[model samples]
Target: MEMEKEFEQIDKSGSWAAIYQDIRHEASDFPSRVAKLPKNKNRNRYRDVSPFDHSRIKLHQEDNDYINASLIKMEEAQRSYILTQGPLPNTVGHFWEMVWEQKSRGVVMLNRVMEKGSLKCAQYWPQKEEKEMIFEDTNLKLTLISEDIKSYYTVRQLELENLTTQETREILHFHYTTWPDFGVPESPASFLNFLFKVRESGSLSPEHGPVVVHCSAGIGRSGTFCLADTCLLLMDKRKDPSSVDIKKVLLEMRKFRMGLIQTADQLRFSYLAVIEGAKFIMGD
Candidate 1:
């Protein structure tokens, strides 16, 4: 039972405006219709933008070292920032490259698919695999506190002299859990688990409760995560269950977070997650 909602065509203003806001506020560095770039063909304002340049920050997914050296150079440029990787530094290189480039001396929380033990920091845990592997791994434990959260990420300013070991530990702690694994397919039960867990994750001090989630690229996964969150937000605001359309929220989510999903398989999988998640909430 695919429980997709039928939507009559309406004006596109609300959807477009939301996407426009995400580009300006959430994914400022990445591509978006919200940001007004110059229309000139010859002039590119960020033409010199590269991964390593400190001026720009990048979010990417897990992969091999085919581009590691070049990526390291980009990190050295003090520009490109990263989220996850596959192999680790032996195949990839120095973990310090990302650390040194950051504005602060914090640990870089990366995906642990690549078996790079050298880069492991006490400050964070890696979501190398889903619940199964994560449960088995000692380094990556969920806080289980029921209501503790941190910034989706922190921007640090590295100082002279090698960062002390204590600082490194603080950087990686809970860093991996802060962001969900966007690449993983969310099972029905798992999606509900995520939904419930997210609600209990607590909010920043004096702020409404919500979390910042991203993937290799922030647009797709980030957008979908936002969609689910926004759908519920609207549900409460309108106080009418009939107005809720998860699919419509999803389509609107795409307008702002282009390529929010990785592939067609993930696309279909998400709808199932939504249905299962809804049923879990509704006790269906």
Candidate 2:
């Protein structure tokens, strides 16, 4: 109850915007590190899209070294995540290469294929009947082992194989299909439900590699998801739900990957979700 009032106070104070502004100022230094790699040039779909040097994921493959992805590590939470953009048609092979390189256990997709009549993401997975999607460019294959379709989200078990090495691993794809391109989810309950489902699988655990998270630009919705999940985890760890400062946590995360928690509405929704998540852990 006390934490709820503090949240109300924070919301009423309109400090989220100020904090966001400060975060932007701190994040301004991010672009200075954006190297003009011959590989990254023309690789990105948009001119504005590039990865910060400090956190950028470097491809080990000799030929294709262009992938706009960042590795974000929150050591306090013992969590690591690969935050990347929605895979462009040309970069889809690079996308799978990153997954294989990172050894990620899950892919958390926060956007749909098409939004507002624009293509936000490619159909990166194989259809149910086809049962497998092959990326010939990277010599990688993704076979759909199983799929559980829910009203708000879908979970798929895929088998990722490196054709060259003949090595294979299981990957879980948690796709949230309902969120809009530039909007928040319907409610904290539904969002938390989806988050918990990811947690239940132990995919987000440190025992595995970073889970790959993405949206269109991989900033807005993706940022919100990471921020909320980290905050809730911190809350559970500290046992003091109110002590977790949402703004501070977000700023810290932004240090790892350039812009996180994109909008004022996203920041607000993060608080709502964290508070709701705290209640959940507290048995409220």
Candidate 3:
């Protein structure tokens, strides 16, 4: 009876660290030429964080084609997500322009405009008193029609209008404010509850272009959010959720954008979120 398996096994049962290293190691040599160009240097939040050239989303504007954004599409789940950085002061117009061009129904913000007494992201959207803000460069204006505030998250209904054509579209802005700057949410229960709230809006459906997700650099928290939701969606679509490989799925997601799941803890948090969310998906 060889029953001492716990003793026999190596003590490092927590493989998330190794997995995180592998993800980072695999990305070491990946090319991000456009993001490193002299003209685009100031546009990126972190020098190390950049959209891979192959999948980077492009703006139709003349001469200024690049913005630090990527479209992550999962074929199996029939879902698409636009993973991007928090808008810099200069890129605020570009941010709205991408939303308009992509026809995105929602913008899921995972970080606060200010974190740890530093301005991590620009205050691009309109607040209550301001009510409206215009991006003259993009010729678009955003109005805060309604705002719903919860304990951990805030949902604002925004109307985006193209001033040139006078065409307007509705956009949902969901901000998860309580997440720590570089850490996971308090619990997956709260996180998934917020995620399901986003799902209820049906903004993530394939009929719409794609949901634009962003945090400070767009990879860490944003990737975790997208990965968890995507894995759950795949589990729901396929009859057997058991066959899904989360690590491989993450690697595929990284193809669209680099440095996803920045830390080992983030990777573990993603796993926790997926496992807990499965209980709901399983109907109990």
Candidate 4:
């Protein structure tokens, strides 16, 4: 299959911007070529002679592109909705408390500044607590591994600084999906693997239970993942039941979730990742 190029724009003030800029340059290299060499019939020798370098690279994007909601949305009351912002407006808080009070099973927090100045804080759309499992937010990173160790409402910090990486090529195992990080190549795969690898290492299962994902406002990264996965699942179904419509599936999910991948860059990563993920499985 042919790949598409993902592009995004965002606003942030930090070194992250510089790092992303370099990655964007690489990702923008459309149709990144692949090379293959001729083999000697007797010695089985080969040389790099192909002009099309069919290689893939994952990219990272800021959390500003696609975020449009303050609180993350839950699909059902049975599944919990945890608000991962620092401090939000009185009204939104009221609503969050109400929803959490009524349905939120538990709350897992990442300890980051949630004040008005913070990006997540700026997106807060206050609501009442509606669930019963509300607890003080915990400082957890998105790259969390092994949430299976302890069960007493657990949370952990994650970072790519310590992660090990490998590069190789293979064929499709199955269909997969991605979210807001569309129109790009690298970011989607990076974000997807970030979640998949972390979950795999932790011995967690995507089907074991509903995942509560969040970022600054739980919209950019969190929303991206939710929407993308939903789309991928539908695509996979099409190959099986063979009746899923990708657009309708994505739209329905968005209508309920309120927002998605915060930026175009993130969408880029998500797009390609979904394409590739469909061909494989989480732990395969």
Candidate 5:
């Protein structure tokens, strides 16, 4: 039955290059007008990786509602994710606001704050001596409740408070510390283990608004994570591993954002992760 292009068929061919090209062609030049405003230039982490206007998340700021973030939802998988750039020093408050406004349960940070001797992201949360951070723009206060550090990643429990109404919510901060920018993991084992823990926390459930997922640019690694996770969920839901089309699923994700799975290696890594995800879920 050739009614759909199954993942295994294309993965067996080893033509990741061709699949990447097709996805690129399908998502070619989707608009990102709001990311180009005169004042909003510095808000973007990377010049080219901007959120498309239609799917971009807007803040309460009426003067300029620009934040480099996109909301991607896959109804079939019952997943909603806000893929976004790592917070700029100035956008740190805005980042917290996105979490607060959207009522997200967690922030999954896929990149280290510093990478290869350059700062990839601001220390948006409190650390070391600073136990609390107060953002006046959002009228919010953040306190680090506790932390558990794994060899490759770290998890911190945080409390977000609104200064206005004094309402508070506990937020999970999942930091995948060792993953490099523009680099694939050595294998999917560690990544899946980390992902499994995140899922166990129930942070990705639909009961919340959406999980905030980000790396430096929020397209490359972020997209890989989103694509692989959603693809596996789709496969599992159908109870048939071959029922999903990763390329088509990826193209669908790009409709909400831009430049997902930046390099050929990333595309390949996504396949590897999905294979592991499918196998893991089958045995479960």
Candidate 6:
């Protein structure tokens, strides 16, 4: 009972902000093993961004090759996610290579292809008019099989194939269209609905490899979605909808991805979304 009300206190006192600051402090000066990689200096979407070595995803086939991506695993919550930066024009092949090697079933993209005047993310996937988009560097091809467009998101069926072996697998691409670059969604209802759609596909299930999730920088909005999902999963596991520690969970998630929630607003929104999800889980 006490624990249940603690969540209410978080909102009333605005403690998520305090917790957010603490995480930021801890993240300061953390070693970025890939920061010194000559290839990564220009390959990263953000000049200041690099993946933490301990959690970084290293490509097995390539030597001295680095990509701004990380594998985030939460065993207690049964969630595994590959958080990565938006692919640059040159690193698109490396992005596809990671997808193939990881055997990911889906890619959850939270940023738009274009943000304002900037190309926030590369057009790495095949378009509707095009049959396939080939990456010569990695010897991989992404063929668009089908597309289902919705009001807020688009789901595409992609056939990922290794050109050398001709082996192929189906991968789902979920792109959230309306989410702002640095802001939260209008409300949690639409976001939760979209999340449930992804869950229904079983892409988020442990039976599959970690689902690849990315935004422009792969921290702000990407972290928000993953944090909310994990919290809801923990609440569902315990059958107690109101009492999970949102701060603790966010910290644990950040261990896998540097600066998981980039802004205090993103952190607050995470708590709000988790509470809203708990209500739904409890049949409220």
Q: What is the TM-score of each candidate against the true structure?
A: 0.40, 0.92, 0.93, 0.38, 0.93, 0.92
Give a tens-digit lDDT track for model 5, residues 88-163: 9899999999999999998999998779999999989998536588898778888888999988789999999878
Task: Quote the lDDT for 9 in model 2.
Answer: 81
Residue-level lDDT for 217 in candidate 6: 93
Q: Which is the better candidate, 2 or 4, if ranked by lDDT? A: 2
Q: Give the TM-score of candidate 6.
A: 0.92
List lDDT for all candidates, in order. Answer: 0.33, 0.81, 0.86, 0.33, 0.86, 0.83
Error of 4 at 61 (Å): 38
lDDT of 4 by residue, 153-183 (tens): 2233222111123311111111112222222
**How well does candidate 6 score on lDDT at residue 155?**
96
Residue 221 lDDT, candidate 3, scale 0-100: 92
Please write out the lDDT profile of model 6 over residues 174-266, one tens digit for every residue.
999888877888787888888888999989987888999999999989999899899888888885555578777877887777778888788
Stretches off by above 4 angstroms in model 2 are 1-3, 13-19, 31-35
Weakest 10 consecutive residues of candidate 3 by summed lDDT: 1-10
RMSD of each: 13.7, 2.2, 3.6, 21.4, 2.4, 2.1
> For candidate 2, lDDT tens digit of each residue in 176-231?
98898668899888889999999999889878889999999888899988888988
lDDT of 4: 0.33
TM-score, candidate number 2: 0.92
User: How many pairs of residues in model 4 come into backbone collision?
Assistant: 67
Clashes of each: 22, 0, 0, 67, 0, 0
